Scaffold this active site. Structure first.
Site, short mmCIF file in Angstrom:
data_model
loop_
_atom_site.label_atom_id
_atom_site.label_comp_id
_atom_site.label_asym_id
_atom_site.label_seq_id
_atom_site.Cartn_x
_atom_site.Cartn_y
_atom_site.Cartn_z
N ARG A 78 10.62 -7.54 12.46
CA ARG A 78 8.81 -7.28 12.68
C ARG A 78 8.23 -7.63 11.55
NH1 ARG A 78 11.18 -3.68 16.45
NH2 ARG A 78 11.37 -1.94 14.95
N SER A 106 5.77 -2.08 8.68
CA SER A 106 7.14 -1.90 9.58
C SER A 106 8.33 -1.87 8.71
CB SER A 106 7.32 -3.31 10.27
OG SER A 106 8.56 -3.38 10.68
N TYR A 107 9.54 -1.15 9.05
CA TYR A 107 10.73 -1.03 8.24
C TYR A 107 11.57 -1.78 8.99
CZ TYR A 107 9.40 2.81 5.07
OH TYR A 107 8.83 3.77 4.05
N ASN A 108 11.45 -2.62 10.00
CA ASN A 108 12.38 -3.60 10.81
C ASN A 108 12.19 -4.94 10.02
OD1 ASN A 108 12.49 -5.69 13.23
ND2 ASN A 108 14.03 -3.78 13.41
N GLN A 158 -10.96 2.13 2.64
CA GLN A 158 -9.83 1.94 3.41
C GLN A 158 -9.83 3.15 4.61
OE1 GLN A 158 -4.91 2.97 3.39
NE2 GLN A 158 -5.69 1.63 1.91
N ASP A 186 0.65 -1.13 0.16
CA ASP A 186 -0.02 -0.01 0.04
C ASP A 186 0.72 1.51 0.06
OD1 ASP A 186 -2.95 1.14 0.72
OD2 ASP A 186 -1.54 2.19 2.09
N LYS A 209 -2.86 5.86 -4.40
CA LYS A 209 -4.03 6.74 -4.00
C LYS A 209 -3.92 8.16 -4.80
CE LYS A 209 -4.10 4.63 0.54
NZ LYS A 209 -2.35 4.55 0.86
N1 NAP Z 1 -5.56 5.97 3.67
C1 NAP Z 1 -5.01 6.68 4.80
O1 NAP Z 1 -5.40 7.91 4.88
C2 NAP Z 1 -3.97 6.05 5.47
C3 NAP Z 1 -3.65 6.63 6.84
C4 NAP Z 1 -2.67 6.03 7.75
C5 NAP Z 1 -1.88 4.95 7.07
N2 NAP Z 1 -2.43 4.37 5.97
C6 NAP Z 1 -1.58 3.11 5.44
O2 NAP Z 1 -1.57 2.07 6.44
C7 NAP Z 1 -0.34 1.84 6.81
C8 NAP Z 1 -0.11 1.21 8.32
O3 NAP Z 1 -0.47 2.20 9.20
P1 NAP Z 1 0.45 3.26 10.15
O4 NAP Z 1 1.47 3.56 8.99
O5 NAP Z 1 -0.15 4.26 10.59
O6 NAP Z 1 0.87 2.24 10.91
P2 NAP Z 1 0.68 0.83 11.70
O7 NAP Z 1 0.82 -0.32 10.71
O8 NAP Z 1 -0.71 0.91 12.80
O9 NAP Z 1 1.89 0.52 12.59
C9 NAP Z 1 2.56 1.13 13.65
C10 NAP Z 1 3.99 1.24 13.96
O10 NAP Z 1 3.97 -0.35 14.44
C11 NAP Z 1 5.37 -0.58 14.46
N3 NAP Z 1 5.24 -2.21 14.37
C12 NAP Z 1 5.03 -3.03 13.00
N4 NAP Z 1 4.96 -4.26 13.27
C13 NAP Z 1 4.92 -4.32 14.71
C14 NAP Z 1 5.33 -5.50 15.38
N5 NAP Z 1 4.91 -6.67 15.19
N6 NAP Z 1 5.24 -5.30 17.03
C15 NAP Z 1 5.65 -4.01 17.41
N7 NAP Z 1 5.33 -2.75 16.53
C16 NAP Z 1 5.34 -3.17 15.40
C17 NAP Z 1 5.94 0.04 13.24
O11 NAP Z 1 7.28 0.28 13.81
P3 NAP Z 1 8.58 -0.24 12.74
O12 NAP Z 1 8.55 0.37 11.52
O13 NAP Z 1 9.86 0.31 13.43
O14 NAP Z 1 8.45 -1.77 12.92
C18 NAP Z 1 5.21 1.22 13.03
O15 NAP Z 1 5.91 2.43 13.46
C19 NAP Z 1 0.60 3.09 6.40
O16 NAP Z 1 2.02 3.10 6.34
C20 NAP Z 1 -0.12 3.63 4.90
O17 NAP Z 1 0.17 2.42 3.97
C21 NAP Z 1 -3.37 5.12 5.15
#
Ligand code: NAP
Ligand code: TES
Length: 323
Positions: A276, A271-273, A190, A50, A84
């Protein structure tokens, strides 16, 4: 067996993998990290990726995808890529140009899914959040049904296999569904979704129309300032999620992702790790019972991390209505 993976049939006949890889990262994080992260995600078993024009990473994401096809790790038909349409390109005449720009940055022939990113329109131009001399955002008056017709033309041209929306509420979905002459329904909506904001009402409306709900910020969000308040609760510190994780020898993130899969939601995870990323694909290795699902349903508490309230005012701002 890696040529098969869990998916859902969309209302246009195409199939969407149920676990998606989120690619947004704060601007501080070098773009080399996005390239590497997408490669690691594909290696680990993610088949849905995404992104968006406004994430400023499509060059890197596209390079990662192309590198993993050229090295034989995956075929293009086994990658589901989403882009998008940003709000400065809602005018119908500007939709196709925005999609073509994304495709040129990606160096891909088509996207699997193109979404209207956010329903509030802003004035067209190179600025993505155009502001006047007093700091006021420049809103634009656009009929989103006209924007949708332009999205339908992109699907008919083959540039997008499927089309959908993001951040739409009940009223906005109904406006598209009731559009006179509608050719294609949105395949998905989404929206933010996690145990603290489980979207039950909006999810049931989407189910009633065969629209898939795709959950973002499913792990509690990036928590990037000013977009997210630092005083909001940290989702993954939740005691119920942590107790379920401990019982199963999993992690609170895995519990939160599995919850979405079992309620019929397609879930994203950024995740950029390396570890994870590999951990998150373990959502397909266990199942939650009906009592566990009910316990997680009980966490619902009206916590919306991403309000995008700099866009509040216009009638299309989506978060003032109940759902
Ligand atoms: N359509 C929209 O308006 C919209 C808005 C927000 C997000 N999005 C999309 O949704 C994606 C996801 O959401 P988000 O970016 O808000 O985040 P998220 O997926 O809710 O994640 C939050 C954080 O979780 C950590 N993480 C990942 N795996 C983990 C694990 N197994 N254990 C512990 N921590 C973990 C990550 O850090 P590390 O990277 O250090 O692992 C990341 O900073 C975005 O990247 C984007 O593609 C779309
Ligand atoms: C791209 C950008 C930084 C990232 C912003 C974007 C506006 C939309 C947005 C909302 C969020 O809540 C996450 C960050 C993003 C994706 C901003 C517009 C100008 C700024 O440089």
């Amino acid at each position: 067996d890696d040529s098969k993976y869990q998916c859902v049939k969309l209302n246009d006949g195409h199939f969407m993998p149920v676990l998606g890889f989120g690619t947004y990262a704060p601007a501080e994080v070098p773009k080399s990290k996005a390239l590497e992260a997408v490669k690691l995600a594909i290696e680990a078993g993610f088949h849905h990726i995404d992104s968006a024009h406004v994430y400023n990473n499509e060059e890197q994401v596209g390079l990662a995808i192309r590198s993993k096809i050229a090295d034989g790790s995956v075929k293009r038909e086994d990658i589901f890529y989403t882009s998008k349409l940003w709000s400065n390109s809602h005018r119908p005449e500007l939709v196709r140009p925005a999609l073509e720009r994304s495709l040129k940055n990606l160096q891909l022939d088509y996207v699997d899914l193109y979404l209207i990113h956010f329903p509030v329109s802003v004035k067209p131009g190179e600025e993505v959040i155009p502001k006047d001399e007093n700091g006021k955002i420049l809103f634009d008056t656009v009929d989103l049904c006209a924007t949708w017709e332009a999205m339908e033309k992109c699907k008919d041209a083959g540039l997008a296999k499927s089309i959908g929306v993001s951040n739409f509420n009940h009223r906005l979905l109904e406006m598209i569904l009731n559009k006179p002459g509608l050719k294609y329904k949105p395949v998905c909506n989404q929206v933010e979704c996690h145990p603290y904001f489980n979207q039950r009402k909006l999810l049931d409306f989407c189910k009633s129309k065969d629209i898939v709900l795709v959950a973002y910020s499913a792990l509690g969000s990036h928590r990037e300032e000013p977009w997210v308040d630092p005083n909001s609760p940290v989702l993954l510190e939740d005691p119920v999620l942590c107790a379920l994780a401990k019982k199963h020898k999993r992690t609170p993130a895995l519990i939160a992702l599995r919850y979405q899969l079992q309620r019929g939601v397609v879930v994203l995870a950024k995740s950029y790790n390396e570890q994870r990323i590999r951990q998150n694909v373990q959502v397909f290795e266990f199942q939650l019972t009906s009592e566990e699902m009910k316990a997680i349903d009980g966490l619902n508490r009206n916590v919306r991390y991403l309000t995008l309230d700099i866009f509040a005012g216009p009638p299309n701002y989506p978060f003032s209505d109940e759902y």
